[PDB]
Design an enzyme around this catalytic site. Structure first.
Site, mmCIF file in Angstrom:
data_model
loop_
_atom_site.group_PDB
_atom_site.id
_atom_site.type_symbol
_atom_site.label_atom_id
_atom_site.label_comp_id
_atom_site.label_asym_id
_atom_site.label_seq_id
_atom_site.Cartn_x
_atom_site.Cartn_y
_atom_site.Cartn_z
ATOM 1 N N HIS A 94 -17.607 17.699 20.933
ATOM 2 C CA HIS A 94 -16.905 16.428 20.769
ATOM 3 C C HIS A 94 -17.395 15.306 21.665
ATOM 4 C CE1 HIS A 94 -13.913 19.375 19.154
ATOM 5 N NE2 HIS A 94 -13.765 18.432 18.241
ATOM 6 N N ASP A 143 -12.523 10.686 18.319
ATOM 7 C CA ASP A 143 -12.566 11.733 19.344
ATOM 8 C C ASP A 143 -12.917 11.163 20.726
ATOM 9 O OD1 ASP A 143 -11.862 14.292 18.368
ATOM 10 O OD2 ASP A 143 -13.781 14.517 17.366
HETATM 11 C C1 LIG Z 1 -19.495 24.309 13.013
HETATM 12 O O1 LIG Z 1 -18.170 24.820 13.119
HETATM 13 C C2 LIG Z 1 -17.115 23.958 13.416
HETATM 14 C C3 LIG Z 1 -17.189 22.551 13.454
HETATM 15 C C4 LIG Z 1 -16.070 21.759 13.784
HETATM 16 C C5 LIG Z 1 -14.841 22.365 14.115
HETATM 17 C C6 LIG Z 1 -13.590 21.593 14.509
HETATM 18 C C7 LIG Z 1 -12.996 20.831 13.330
HETATM 19 N N1 LIG Z 1 -12.547 19.553 13.864
HETATM 20 C C8 LIG Z 1 -13.143 19.269 15.034
HETATM 21 O O2 LIG Z 1 -13.223 18.152 15.542
HETATM 22 C C9 LIG Z 1 -13.737 20.550 15.642
HETATM 23 C C10 LIG Z 1 -14.766 23.760 14.057
HETATM 24 C C11 LIG Z 1 -15.880 24.570 13.691
HETATM 25 O O3 LIG Z 1 -15.868 25.965 13.568
HETATM 26 C C12 LIG Z 1 -14.631 26.680 13.684
HETATM 27 C C13 LIG Z 1 -14.826 28.099 13.144
HETATM 28 C C14 LIG Z 1 -15.365 28.919 14.311
HETATM 29 C C15 LIG Z 1 -15.273 28.032 15.548
HETATM 30 C C16 LIG Z 1 -14.307 26.918 15.159
HETATM 31 MN MN LIG Z 2 -10.733 16.222 17.179
HETATM 32 ZN ZN LIG Z 3 -14.031 15.006 15.231
#
Ligand SMILES: COc1ccc([C@@H]2CNC(=O)C2)cc1OC1CCCC1
Ligand SMILES: [Mn+2]
Ligand SMILES: [Zn+2]
Ligand SMILES: [As]
Length: 344
Positions: free
Chosen positions: A83, A124
């Site tokens: 982030h 963010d």
């Molecule tokens: C590329 O993966 C991911 C990319 C982004 C996010 C979140 C979604 N909103 C956000 O700002 C962060 C989770 C991910 O993967 C999840 C599954 C396993 C770890 C968490």
């Molecule tokens: Mn967020």
């Molecule tokens: Zn985001």
């Protein structure tokens, strides 16, 4: 103005090549960061605003715009793995592309377009690299101030708007009170909707809207009521925020490495502070591949399938890439003797 970016002609030429994909899903934001002295959010936002003539339309001088963006970008933590401003730039650019999807042509006003891209950029800001629950469990002053509800999301909005008051940073100075109030209402709505705890709610409402889609002869969605327009916009920003798995695997994999790194860093903080380690925050017991497949099957795919239905057939390619990447991660899970490298 290139001198504000401190970019010489050599890297400016490199950037010009990368920016050929400004209106495309295939743009490589990592390359953009690399040629812009790591100011991808400000660079891509300046590019987007020039592309859409938003600076002219809302009378924002390049000076004010760049000063504010550079200030905002500086409030993203470069030491946070996922982030940071690179993710914000990616969401802004992805949102920039979604707004131009055929099915939504001429549907949104310039103010709403300005609102969506701005929301993506600040969504963010000042993220500390830990979850809302971590802030709540440590009795963080931020959690106390926001009463444990959408803590970071509320904070992102407060910072984004607050920075408008620093020297030469008011990019909304020439909007009328009414326009500012409407933009503010929409931005707050879109950023708050990025809270993952609201996902199921947003999805249900999006599906329930697709059930009564009113399309025209040309196949262009018809959204006459504000309520419907803002629901499509909040879902659009939410889709851009969860667009990593829909990008070329080369980009998707970098996003996965980063989100896992950030989770492991939180896991380290929890251990350091005598707290129980959160799910998926322990490097020793993490299952990256499995987590990505589950993440897609239960969250990303359900969302994009619905969006693709709303704007069909605009998002078909994206849907194909997602499923393609999903199967790649599927066969990558240790102990999977079925064409282990790209499918079923
Ligand atoms: C590329 O993966 C991911 C990319 C982004 C996010 C979140 C979604 N909103 C956000 O700002 C962060 C989770 C991910 O993967 C999840 C599954 C396993 C770890 C968490
Ligand atoms: Mn967020
Ligand atoms: Zn985001
Ligand atoms: As630039």
């Amino acid at each position: 103005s290139i001198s504000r970016f401190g970019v010489n002609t050599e890297n400016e030429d490199h950037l010009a090549k990368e920016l050929e994909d400004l209106n495309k899903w295939g743009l490589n934001i990592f390359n953009v960061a690399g040629y812009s002295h790591n100011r991808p959010l400000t660079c891509i936002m300046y590019a987007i605003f020039q592309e859409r003539d938003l600076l002219k339309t809302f009378r924002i001088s390049s000076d004010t715009f760049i000063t504010y963006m550079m200030t905002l970008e500086d409030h993203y933590h470069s030491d946070v793995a996922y982030h940071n401003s690179l993710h914000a730039a990616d969401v802004a650019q992805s949102t920039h592309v979604l707004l131009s999807t055929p099915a939504l042509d001429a549907v949104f006003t310039d103010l709403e377009i300005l609102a969506a891209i701005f929301a993506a950029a600040i969504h963010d800001v000042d993220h500390p690299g830990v979850s809302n629950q971590f802030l709540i469990n440590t009795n963080s002053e931020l959690a106390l101030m926001y009463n444990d509800e959408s803590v970071l999301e509320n904070h992102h909005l407060a910072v984004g708007f607050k920075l408008l008051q620093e020297e030469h940073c008011d990019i909304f100075m020439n909007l009328t009170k009414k326009q500012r109030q409407t933009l503010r209402k929409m931005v707050i709505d879109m950023v708050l909707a990025t809270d993952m705890s609201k996902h199921m709610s947003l999805l249900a409402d999006l599906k329930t809207m697709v059930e009564t889609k009113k399309v025209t002869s040309s196949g262009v969605l018809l959204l006459d009521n504000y309520t419907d327009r803002i629901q499509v916009l909040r879902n659009m920003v939410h889709c851009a925020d969860l667009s990593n798995p829909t990008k070329s695997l080369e980009l998707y994999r970098q996003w996965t490495d980063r989100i896992m790194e950030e989770f492991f860093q939180q896991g380290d903080k929890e251990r350091e502070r005598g707290m129980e380690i959160s799910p998926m925050c322990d490097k020793h017991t993490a299952s990256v591949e499995k987590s990505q497949v589950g993440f897609i099957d239960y969250i990303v795919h359900p969302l994009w399938e619905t969006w693709a239905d709303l704007v069909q057939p605009d998002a078909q390619d994206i849907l194909d890439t997602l499923e393609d990447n999903r199967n790649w991660y599927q066969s990558m899970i240790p102990q999977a003797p079925a064409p282990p490298l790209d499918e079923q």
